[PDB]
Amino acid sequence: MYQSKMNVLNTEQYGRAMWQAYVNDGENPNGNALGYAYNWGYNADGNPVLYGMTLSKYLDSKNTMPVADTDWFDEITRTGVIQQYNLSVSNGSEKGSSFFSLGYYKNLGVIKDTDFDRFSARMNSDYKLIDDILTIGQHFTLNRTSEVQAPGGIIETALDIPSAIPVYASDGSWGGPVGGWPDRRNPRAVLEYNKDNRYTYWRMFGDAYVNLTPFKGFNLRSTFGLDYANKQARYFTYPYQEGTQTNNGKSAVEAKQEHWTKWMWNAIATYQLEVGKHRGDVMIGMELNREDDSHFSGYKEDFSILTPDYMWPDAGSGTAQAYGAGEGYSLVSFFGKMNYSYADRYLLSLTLRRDGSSRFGKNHRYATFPSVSLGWRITQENFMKELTWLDDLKLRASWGQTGNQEISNLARYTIYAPNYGTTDSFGGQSYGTAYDITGSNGGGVLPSGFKRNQIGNDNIKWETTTQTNVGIDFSLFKQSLYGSLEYYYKKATDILTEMAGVGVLGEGGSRWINSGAMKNQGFEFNLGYRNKTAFGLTYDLNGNISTYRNEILELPETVAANGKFGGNGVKSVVGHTYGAQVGYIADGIFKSQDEVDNHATQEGAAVGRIRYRDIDHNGVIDERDQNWIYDPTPSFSYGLNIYLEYKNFDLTMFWQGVQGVDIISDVKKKSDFWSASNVGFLNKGTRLLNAWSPTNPNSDIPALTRSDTNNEQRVSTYFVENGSFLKLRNIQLGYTVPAVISKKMRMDRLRFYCSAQNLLTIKSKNFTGEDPENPNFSYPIPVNITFGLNIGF
Amino acid sequence: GKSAVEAKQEHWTKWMWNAIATYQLEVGKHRGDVMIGMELNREDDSHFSGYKEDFSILTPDYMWPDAGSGTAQAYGAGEGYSLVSFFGKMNYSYADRYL
Amino acid sequence: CDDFLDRQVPQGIVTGDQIASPEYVDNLVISAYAIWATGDDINSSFSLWNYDVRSDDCYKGGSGTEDGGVFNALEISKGINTTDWNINDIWKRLYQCITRANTALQSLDQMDEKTYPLKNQRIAEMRFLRGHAHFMLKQLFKKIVIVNDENMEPDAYNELSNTTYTNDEQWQKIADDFQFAYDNLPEVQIEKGRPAQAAAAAYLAKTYLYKAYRQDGADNALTGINEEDLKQVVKYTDPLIMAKGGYGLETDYSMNFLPQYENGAESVWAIQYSINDGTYNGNLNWGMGLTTPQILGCCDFHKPSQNLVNAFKTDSQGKPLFSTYDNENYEVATDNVDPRLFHTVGMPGFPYKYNEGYIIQKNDDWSRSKGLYGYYVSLKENVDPDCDCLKKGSYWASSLNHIVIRYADVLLMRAEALIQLNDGRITDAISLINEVRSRAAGSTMLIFNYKEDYGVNFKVTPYDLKAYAQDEAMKMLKWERRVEFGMESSRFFDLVRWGEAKDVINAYYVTEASRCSIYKNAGFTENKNEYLPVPFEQISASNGNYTQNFGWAAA
Amino acid sequence: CDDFLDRQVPQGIVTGDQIASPEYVDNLVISAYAIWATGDDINSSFSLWNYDVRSDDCYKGGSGTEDGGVFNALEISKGINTTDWNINDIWKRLYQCITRANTALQSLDQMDEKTYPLKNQRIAEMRFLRGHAHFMLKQLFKKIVIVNDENMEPDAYNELSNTTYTNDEQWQKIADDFQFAYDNLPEVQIEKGRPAQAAAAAYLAKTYLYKAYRQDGADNALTGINEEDLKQVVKYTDPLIMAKGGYGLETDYSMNFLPQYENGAESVWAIQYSINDGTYNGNLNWGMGLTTPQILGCCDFHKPSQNLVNAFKTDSQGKPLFSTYDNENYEVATDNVDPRLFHTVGMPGFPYKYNEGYIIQKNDDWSRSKGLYGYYVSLKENVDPDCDCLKKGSYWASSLNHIVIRYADVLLMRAEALIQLNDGRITDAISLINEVRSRAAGSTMLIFNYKEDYGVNFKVTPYDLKAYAQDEAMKMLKWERRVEFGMESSRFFDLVRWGEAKDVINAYYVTEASRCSIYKNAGFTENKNEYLPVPFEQISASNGNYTQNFGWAAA
């Protein structure tokens, strides 16, 4: 079930807000070229007051679109249904083991015409031959998933389309805007037109291995992994026509195919030895990886019958396009690892890799990454054994590095592409190389060429992330109080950055550079208490908490000005958190002509408008008056699992909180203003019914205006809110039938249970939307309520 | 100087489902099987392909549809059938000498 | 360990070292043309119309003042921020066109002429394109970066500046590009999208015409008019050079804006938009995708002003009402009018693109603004709704060529420099104005029966050839440029050449408030609003190597 | 048990009950045109050229006598078997065109006219097509099956016969089809591939012209000439009917066979071949794919005869050498010649399709036969090697339209019937021959300098308007049809209309043996070889309902 649903004006409410917006600006509210007419006048003090309100019956003069009070979110949501079934079976003999499972999932999301499902089989087995010294094994899973996904932007469209627009037009077609009504598409119709854009996805995952133990402590092993998926889909383009929202009469189909084929191969050599007090592992080995991808698709326009049965490429009578390309990479890897344990109380560990990637030139192919960790089982040292209340306590510290090469397969190269221009754009800017050099106006193939996509860089190398870590494990009161702490410092250097080009460089001037650095340090804490009670109740709490800070250390000059990782391209994010943002400081509202004239010069400032702070004190409110106003890093997050067992019943709660987080709300643009949007007459949030006026002087909401004279759309503290939350992620209640009862139906375990996920949300009073975890337009987070069972033989 | 490439794909998906009920009995000298049951079959096929003309580099590394500068064609269609089947079979053997 | 990490290599691309091979040199040339069709979008057309909303010719249109709020800010001269996304956008896009020119030039420079005899005509073509963009950046931003070292490494672009050169020698670095093109282009281009020599002369002249109204001080005011520069506009609009290329005025005005008449004698150089051409929906003029009227559902941008409407009014003898034209609306029944009004402005009660089956009305069906932006439609770039040339992608766009230099421009630009050089050749500038004015008075094919069907009184006459004063002559050329190039997105550009922007537009703001409510709070600040600010992100990345224009605060 | 075996249904097709819906009626009409472009192949072009190799105009060409052995058998009149694959093939293909006509007519018959006002013009179009095929089958086979019941069930086709009707009333059932078309087609077709009313008249006339040379006996000889039929050729070639449609002779002969001049005033009805049109390689004229010369690698079919060459020779006053033309080869230096030779026959030393850069020689490079079939190339259907219209699929083919009725045909057909009706209108038939003959004498654009560059003496004059005898007049029309329609695949068809096949071709066999060795053993058997045998498999499936033509054994 859809839960946190956004409150959005209704047809009557829409007309009240509009009258306010008009009269605030001092224009005749009867001049809205929609269907509203207003009986209004002035109060004793001279401020405008609304008396009555009449709406016409149709939105057009020719009466093809009736007037509604449509709740568009209720109209695009539904009660979802989930199903889940899984069977698994296992066998274990002296000479081997064997496992087999079958599974199914099916989930009809709360947004209509979106769903997902999965079929799964897995078989694993292993065999011990000779003297259990030759061993063969296999793990393999096979899966078929299929999904129809929510279109891009339906939540914003549902927020945007006014109640007055009906779901169905008089003729029974889909409803749409006409007359003066805004440029917004019918969101029910979008979802329905997209219901057959289903992909089918087959993934096979598994490995096979051989293991040899030629004598005591010596092992050899070789594993070949296979990871292969393929995805097919027809995407259909049906013709639409919702009022003035038209598509001409375009019909098309695109049959798309993709393949991802990855495989892995390694060989491993490990020695073990136990010398009275010394313990020790050594392991050296080698690994190969390779991915090869391909994708292609055929596109055809114009169909006589508009159903997925007809809409195959062979049956189109219009223009065709063909798409596709491949790519891939490979990795080689040489590694060793060394473990040592003295007297089971001092532990040392050593890792060393040399790692090559096809994504670099040979002059930089490999890089070498060592690692070191130490252990100190304090309690086994004899002077700690005067402490009956502390079972084990172990201090550990580690330093080590890891390469990163997760970059474009083409990162090294200067890329020219023919890009004739066969591909959907938006508003032009296809950047194609075809051109009617002849002046014929077309009708036939044009001459074309090549355009630069990327400048190469001969000396890209491995990026290095380096971590230092320290923590301590503990166990008190004979294993009932347990947990661990963690402190780490984590720095990425020579960071591999897709770096934009300087403006004058022009088309495709970007290049991947090792240029940039970024830290993450923080604390991590686990703590669990568990004990029985002397009336029948077992209780087991185990919670956790953590916090971190992130700081960008250096950055290419053109990425600092870019804003790609931070301050909106007005200030450089070097020295701030990844994703921090700069903006104007909103300092309330001008409430009196007095307060505009005494403020800095502010273009568009008047009574009822946002007062922006004069940060440089220059007596002018201009682009220079912005500062660091947004950081996405919580002060801390935390989780907690309560578990109870009483009298064959069991109860679980899992709580999760994030505390101290800034969110940026873009719904607030739609909820607190009549004109903080590109387009006039959109549906608005229900909060602006409380907008400041002479009438209503106790408010934070700017006075309703029809033009963003004050540019209150500018990034500002007005949109940052406290996105802190605590959520009951899950609660589950269970009964398990006593053994003596189920064991006679030959059942080691029979249990039924009942649960609800995401049932409850605690948030800040200063947050003004619904889900602080999903404050804008992403697929809503539903409340699930579940029943289920467990049977085992 | 024609150069072209055609990327072709085909799928044949057949599945079968049956349920079977069989009785046996051995009476001193008589022997006998009976079996009745039901079977469902379904095949669904699809095939499609993208065709592109005119390539600057004439190797299978270059000759992908995305990289042609000439005319394109698109092909494909589906088909299928299903079968239902009801059957019984009866075996009898007397004294292991008449069947 | 080694062969393994080299096997897989880039698929479906040309790499940077390969791109310079001769087999690709002509691919790069074409691609440098292509971006002028494929590189703009609905808010950045290389028409620069989205920015001529500053002019007194038109309003931005659309749903309302927020429908592209940054362009409303531009239209009323208030609340422009240097951080605004459009300003950054157009700067970025134009330098992208420059890239394709330079990349082609980089590989063309290495070509051997004995085995590629068009080497210098191709090179000329590219330098023409490079001049085209630098020219438009210069118009938009004044203080621009000169990017004309096709051999410059990527890293060296970081140490460029928009003040390496003074304002004049910035203009000259543009002139140099178009000059080489004149020296090297062929007289006739059988492939019509390629500029001919006359086009290089035309643009060369236009560059010196803009260069001659000098701003060699620190702000934007005129510091005197240079006549070394003007005598060039004369040299490179010489009729003898234009006749070597066969250019001239179409015998009816409307031909410059009609699909059937592409690449005519007046189209000196145009962007060759095309249809049915292998691309997804066509190489259409997406940049004008916003300016189709509501009859196609969207979007009603680029609507002409009542000011421009009333400008086609004419006195009883067929001359402009210089002083009185804006004091009462154009009334069809009783006013004399210039035929060019009905080729520029589609007006209620009259046919849309010469089609009696689409009559424009003050309606839901034509304008989107409930009257805020008025009820007029821009005719020049739109086309007949029935045209083969018209398709809907994400927007409605046509294949109608965008003409960068109409030969009327060449005649009127020649007229200008002659009038500015008071040197006896003024009766020759009046000779040129009468060329355009008389052609226009007879451009009544396709609207020949408007007297009987609607009542319009066409009345336009040439000026008597007298010994005109320089000041009265300027007024007459200015007026001809008003009616000749309406809605073609160089009206505001003309005003900043003349140093008259504040006076004429701030005045327009008070006269036009009566008819378009948005101009209520409009105010042009001289020595500030004559050019877009250099984009904030651009300056900020420059490490103080870029310098902001005058009038804007230290941000 | 039941829902299970109904779920899957046909993919990507229309079923027979659906096909009759009105939404598909115009799809069927187009499809009935389409098969005239898409239904022939290299051995069965609806040009019927592969079968005019029987004529004295040309040789089959190719590698050798086995390169299409069944057409060599046809060319020499020996070893034709009724089982031969080509004879069956062309019979089958032409009836396939008939199918598409009838299917469209079947659904058109059910349409309501008040809500589909073109119902009878569409119906007329289809009956025109149906007449076109029946006409050509009638020419090929004499004894054909009349398939004109568009409502006939599949099974009823088994009880059809090629002798339901006598020979004359077989001709009339064709005439009926073209008559209705005349009564119902519109005077002008804005979509040029659709026959206009004049085309229906032209074909109507042609049908009565062939009908009037009657063979009402059991064999193939002439049984007298009917003048009721001839007076129809007059009615339906009336100049007034042709002028209502705007037809006439192109001012230069070569225009009928040149891509730039498609659908001209002489093209009365043509097969609209096309390029760049969505199909795999184009809707090109694949049927002439064999007849391109060796300059394109293959295949050198349809090579003109020395007989036809020498026929363009003219006496000192520009008239045909009626008696002497074949007694010495055409010698360029010293013989007067008809300009039409250089529009029909590409000859060694002369330009291929008017292109001085492709001179034909007695070479490996032009002819494939090592001289067996000579060294001449057929000009009419080939095109300039540089033409946009020319593509290679499996063969080289163009988009040059195939004209079924040239308006020269109409003038010359009118001439014929007037000469046959000795009734005072003979000086009017000579008037018509002079129309074609004088047009041709001046058709020297594109070959105007052949006197100075090669030495040819063009010399063609009209006939004096005297009171000519009927026999001399026939000779003059016959000669004009020789030079006017050379290599257009109706020469042999003309001879069997005249009952002159044995006499003229058997004679040709002895005169031309000297120049083409294949005619060594050739022998035309009269009352046998004037028509292809009805195909053996066709008769044999008929259950004796079909009857073989005269002269062939009971097989």
Q: Is A422:C176 a contact under the CB 8 Å cutoff? A: no
Handedness of CA C472, C478, C484, C486 (dihedral sign): negative
Nearest CA-CA partner of D175 in D212, D149, D143: D212
Alpha carbon of residue A172 to chain centroid: 38
With an 8 Å Cβ cutoff, is C398 touching chain A? no
**Contact yes or no for D291/D49 (Cβ under 8 A):** yes
First-residue to last-residue Cα distance in chain D = 53
Count of residues in chain C = 555
CA C349 vs. chain centroid, Å, equals 29
**CA C170/CA C221 separation, integer angstroms:** 17
Q: Whole-angstrom Cα distance, residue D133 to residue C436?
A: 61
Q: DSSP code of A495?
A: -
Q: Smallest Cα–Cα separation from C41: which of C397, C280, C366?
A: C397
- Give which of D4, D276, D277, D284 to mutate to test B binding, by max B Cβ within 10 Å: D4
Contact A149, A197 (CB under 8 A): yes
CA pair distance A417, C12, nearest whole angstrom: 7
Which residue among B78, B79, B84 places its CB closest to the CB of D1? B84
- Cross-strand bridge partners of residue D397: D391
- Between the alpha carbon of residue A603 and those of residues C76, C521, C532, the distances in Å are 12, 10, 17
The sign one gets for the Cα dihedral A310, A313, A315, A319 is: positive
- d(Cα A226, Cα A265) in Å, to the nearest integer? 9
D11 in contact with chain A, both atoms CB, cutoff 8 A: yes
Q: Is C218 exposed, middle or buried (0-12, 13-18, 19+ CB in 10 A)?
A: exposed
Q: Could you count the other beta carbons within 10 Å of the beta carbon of residue A276?
A: 6
Report the alpha-carbon distance of residue A100 to residue D361 in Å, rounded. 80
Tell me which residue has tokens 């001279």.
A46
Nearest to B65 among A312, A314, A323 (CB): A323
Among A295, A296, A301, most B C-beta atoms within 10 A, so best to mutate, is A296
3-state secondary structure of A37: strand
C12 interfacial to chain B (CB closer than 8 Å) = yes
**Nearest Cα residue to C69 out of A612, A18, A675:** A675
Would strands C390-392 and C377-378 be described as parallel, antiparallel, or unpaired? unpaired
Q: Is A614 flagged in the annotation as binding?
A: yes
Closest CA to A601 of A589, A612, A586: A612
Which of A314, A443, A444 has the CB atom closest to D12's CB atom?
Answer: A314
Sequence-distant (6+) residues with CB within 8 A of C19 are: A414, A416, A450, A452, C28, C103, C107
Residue A326's CB is within 10 A of a number of other CB atoms, namely: 18
Maximum CA extent, chain C: 91
Give, in order, the Cα–Cα distances in Å from A714 to each of A627, A669, A700, C90: 13, 10, 17, 20
Rg (CA), chain D: 24
Cα–Cα distance between A529 and A538 in angstroms, integer? 11
Whether omega for the bond prior to residue C58 falls within 30 degrees of 0, making it cis, is no
SS3 for D37?
helix
CA nearest C179: which of C140, C139, C232? C232
Six token digits for residue D285: 């004229």
Interatomic CA distance for residues C67 and C70, integer angstroms: 9
Give all chains having 3 or more CB-to-CB distances under 8 Å with chain B.
A, C, D
CA atoms of D503 and D507, how far apart (whole Å): 6
Q: For residues D522 and D101, what is the distance between their CA atoms, to the nearest angstrom? A: 39
**D11 vs B78: CB contact, 8 Å cut-off?**
yes
Give the Å distances, CA to CA, from D119 to A101, C250, D107, D113, D122.
67, 45, 10, 6, 5
**Residues A647, A621: contact at Cβ < 8 Å?**
no
Cβ-based contacts under 8 A for chains A and D: 9
Q: Which long-range contacts (CB under 8 A, 24 or more apart) does C386-390 make?
A: C386/C355, C387/C259, C388/C259, C388/C275, C389/A441, C389/C259, C389/C275
Q: Which two tokens stand for residue C145?
A: 């970066």
**Structural contact between residues C249 and C433, judged by C-beta atoms closer than 8 angstroms:** no
- Cα(A403)–Cα(A495) distance, rounded to whole angstroms? 10
CB atoms C6 and A435 under 8 Å: no
- The answer to whether the CB of D234 falls within 8 A of the CB of D206 is no
Shortest alpha-carbon distance between residue B68 and chain C (Å): 10
D508 φ/ψ angles, rounded to the nearest 5 degrees: -50, -40
Taking an 8 Å cut-off on Cβ atoms, the answer to whether A296 and B7 are in contact is yes
| B66–A445 CB contact, under 8 Å | no
Of A334, A362, A431, the CB nearest to C35: A431
Return phi, psi of residue B14, to 5°. -115, 145
Alpha carbon of A315: minimum distance to chain B alpha carbons (Å): 8
> Is the CB of A108 inside 8 Å of chain B's CB atoms?
no
Q: Is the dihedral of CA C531, C537, C541, C544 positive or negative?
A: positive
> What token pair was written down for C159?
């140490």
The answer to whether the CB of A403 falls within 8 A of the CB of A331 is no
- For C338, the enclosing helix (H) or strand (E) is none
Cβ atoms of D287 and D41 closer than 8 Å: yes
For A115, A233, A784, C83, the CA distances from A146, given in Å and listed in that order, are 8, 10, 21, 44
Contacts of A518 (CB under 8 A, 6+ apart): A491, A492, A495, A550, A551, A552, A553, A578
CA distance A148 to A155: 16
**Partner-chain contact A315 D276, CB within 8 Å:** no
> Which of A358, A413, A442 shows the shortest C-beta gap to C8?
A358
B49 touches chain A (CB under 8 A): yes
Cα(A661)–Cα(A640) distance, rounded to whole angstroms? 19
Q: Six-digit token pair at D148?
A: 């004109």
What tokens does D196 get? 């206009």
- Taking the CA atoms of residue A679, residue A683, residue A688 and residue A693 in that order, the dihedral angle to the nearest 10 degrees is 60
* Distance of alpha carbon B75 from alpha carbon D367, whole angstroms: 40
Backbone angles phi, psi at D498, to 5 degrees: -85, -5
**Rounded to whole angstroms, how far apart are CA atoms D503 and D487?**
20
Q: For A317, which residue in chain D has the nearest alpha carbon?
A: D278
Q: b vs e for A460-478, b when ≥16 Cβ sit within 10 Å of the residue's Cβ?
A: bbbbbbbbebebbbbbbee
Q: Find residues 346-385 of chain C whose CB sits inside 8 Å of chain B.
A: none
Interface contact flag, D11 A312, Cβ < 8 Å: yes
Residue A362 to residue A358: CA distance in whole angstroms: 8
- Is A622 a known ligand-binding residue? yes
Give resolution, Å, one decimal.
Answer: 4.2
C233 and C413 in contact (C-beta within 8 Å)? Answer: yes
The Cα C35–Cα C93 span in angstroms is 9
A14: tokens are 């829409």
C219, C550 in Cβ contact below 8 A?
A: yes
Q: How far apart are the first and last CA of chain A?
A: 35
Using a CB-CB distance cutoff of 8 angstroms, which residues of chain B are in contact with residue D5? 82-84
Site from B44, B64, B66, B73 to mutate, A interface, most A CB atoms within 10 angstroms: B66
Q: Is D262 annotated as a binding residue?
A: yes
User: Chain D contacts of A310, Cβ < 8 Å?
Assistant: 12
**CA A364 to CA A366: how far, in whole Å?**
6
The rounded distance, in Å, linking the Cα atoms of B13 and A230 is: 16
DSSP letter assigned to residue A555 = -
CA–CA distance, D187 with D244 (Å, rounded to integer): 6
Task: Measure CA C217 to chain center.
Answer: 26
Residue C4 parent element (H or E): none
User: Other C-beta atoms within 10 Å of B64: how many?
Assistant: 23
Query: Are A696 and A615 spatial neighbours (Cβ–Cβ below 8 Å)?
Result: no
Query: Quick check: A676 and A715 in contact, CB under 8 A?
Result: no
Return all residues near D78 (Cβ < 8 A) that are at least 6 apart.
D521, D522, D523
Helix/strand/coil percent split, chain A, to 5: 10, 50, 40
Reported as type and span, the H/E element at residue A270 is: strand A252-275
Residue A582 is assigned to a ligand binding site: no
Q: Return the beta strands (E) in A302-365 as ranges.
A: 320-342, 346-357
DSSP code of D18?
G
- As a whole number of angstroms, the distance between CA A180 and CA A59 comes to 8
State how far the Cα of A727 lies from the Cα of A27, in Å rounded to an integer: 47
The domain in which residue C266 lies consists of 1-555
Closest to C95 in 3D by CA, of A394, A501, D443, D272: A501
Query: How many CB contacts within 8 angstroms connect chain A with chain C?
Result: 393
C495-504 burial: b if 16+ Cβ within 10 Å, else e = bbbebebbeb
- One-letter identity of residue B66: D
- State how far the Cα of C265 lies from the Cα of C407, in Å rounded to an integer: 8
* Distance spanning both ends of chain C, measured CA to CA: 53
Rounded CA separation B55/B74 (Å): 18
Do residue C73 and residue A711 have CB atoms under 8 angstroms apart?
yes
Name the residue among A436, A557, A681 with its Cβ closest to that of C541. Answer: A557
Q: From the candidates B52, B56, B57, which should be mutated to test the interface with C, based on the most C CB atoms within 10 A?
A: B56
Q: Where are the beta strands (DSSP E) in A455-590?
A: 463-476, 481-493, 496-499, 511-514, 517-532, 537-554, 581-584, 586-589
Q: Which chain D residue is nearest to residue A443, measuring alpha carbons?
A: D276
Up-side HSE of residue A229: CA atoms within 13 Å toward CB?
A: 12
How far is the C-alpha of D494 from the C-alpha of D483, rounded, in Å?
13
How far apart CA C291 and CA C42 sit, in angstroms, is 9
Q: In this structure, what token pair is assigned to residue A508?
A: 């495709």
State the smallest CA–CA distance between residue B70 and chain D in angstroms.
11
Residues pairing with A127 in the sheet: A96, A136
Q: How far apart are CA D136 and CA D94, in angstroms?
A: 8
Answer whether C263's CB lies under 8 Å from A437's CB: no
Substitution target in B53, B54, B57, B61 with the highest count of C β-carbons within 10 Å is B61
Q: Is D401 annotated to bind ligand?
A: yes
Largest alpha-carbon pair distance within chain D? 91
Beta bridge partner(s), residue A271: A218, A282
Residues of chain D immediately before an interruption (C to N > 2.5 Å): none
CB contact under 8 A, C538 and A624: no
- Token code pair at residue D4: 């299970």
Amino acid at B17: W
Tell me, rounded to whole angstroms, the distance of Cα C207 from its chain centroid.
13
Question: Between D4, D10, D12, which is nearest B82 by CB?
Answer: D4
Q: C480: which 2 tokens?
A: 């001809």
**Is there a binding annotation on residue D305?**
no
**Cα–Cα distance, A475 to A390 (Å, whole number):** 6
Angle between helices D25-38 and D85-109 (to 10 degrees): 160
Q: How far apart are CA A229 and CA A264, in angstroms?
A: 15
Amino acid occupying residue C353: K
β pairing state of D457-458 and D336-337? parallel
The 3-state secondary structure of D356-370 reads CCCECCCCCCCCCCC
CA angle A407, A410, A412 (to 5 degrees): 85
Q: What backbone phi and psi angles, to 5 degrees, belong to D527? A: 60, 40
Q: State whether B7 and A255 contact (CB < 8 Å).
A: no
DSSP assigned state of A716: B
CA distance C258 to chain A (A): 13
- Report the residue numbers after which chain C has a gap, meaning the C atom sits over 2.5 angstroms from the next written residue's N, or none: none
- Cα A738 to chain centroid distance, Å, stands at 43
The CA distance from C549 to D30, in Å, is 66
Does D53 show up as a binding residue in the annotation? yes
Q: Which residues of D touch A309 (CB under 8 A)?
A: 11
Both tokens of A8, joined, read: 């959005």
Whole-Å CA distances, A497 to A363, A364, A405, A558, C80:
19, 16, 11, 11, 33
First to last CA, chain B: 73
- Name the residue type at position A95: K
Nearest CB neighbour to B74, from listed A313, A325, A420: A313
Q: How many CB atoms neighbour CB D235 within 10 A?
A: 15
The pair phi, psi for residue C159, each rounded to 5°, is -100, 15
Cis check: omega of the bond before D299, within 30 degrees of 0: yes
Q: What residue type is assigned to position C102 of the chain?
A: N
Any chains having at least 3 CB pairs less than 8 A from chain C are A, B
Q: Is the separation of the CB atoms in A698 and A729 below 8 Å?
A: no
One-letter amino acid at C14 equals V
Closest CA in chain B for residue D280 = B73
Cα gap B51→B75, rounded to integer Å: 8
Question: What three-state secondary structure class fits A149?
Answer: coil
Nearest neighbour of D12 by CB, restricted to A315, A443, A444 = A315
Using alpha carbons only, give the angle A259, A261, A262 rounded to the nearest 5 degrees: 150
In contact, C230 and C212? CB cutoff 8 Å: yes
Cβ distance of D12 and A312 shorter than 8 Å: yes
**What SS3 class is residue A28?**
coil
Check if the beta carbon of residue C436 is closer than 8 Å to that of residue C416. Answer: no
SS (H, E, C) C142-198: CCCCCCCCCCCCCHHHHHCCCCCCCHHHHHHHHHHHHHHHHHHCCCCCCCCCCCCHH
The residues facing A322 across adjacent strands are A298
All residues of chain A having their beta carbon less than 8 Å from the beta carbon of residue B74 are: 298-300, 313-314, 316, 320, 322
The Cα–Cα gap between C362 and C385 comes to 19
Query: How far apart are alpha carbons A113 and A75 in whole angstroms?
Result: 12
Strands (E), A494-516: 496-499, 511-514
Quote the number of domains for chain C: 1
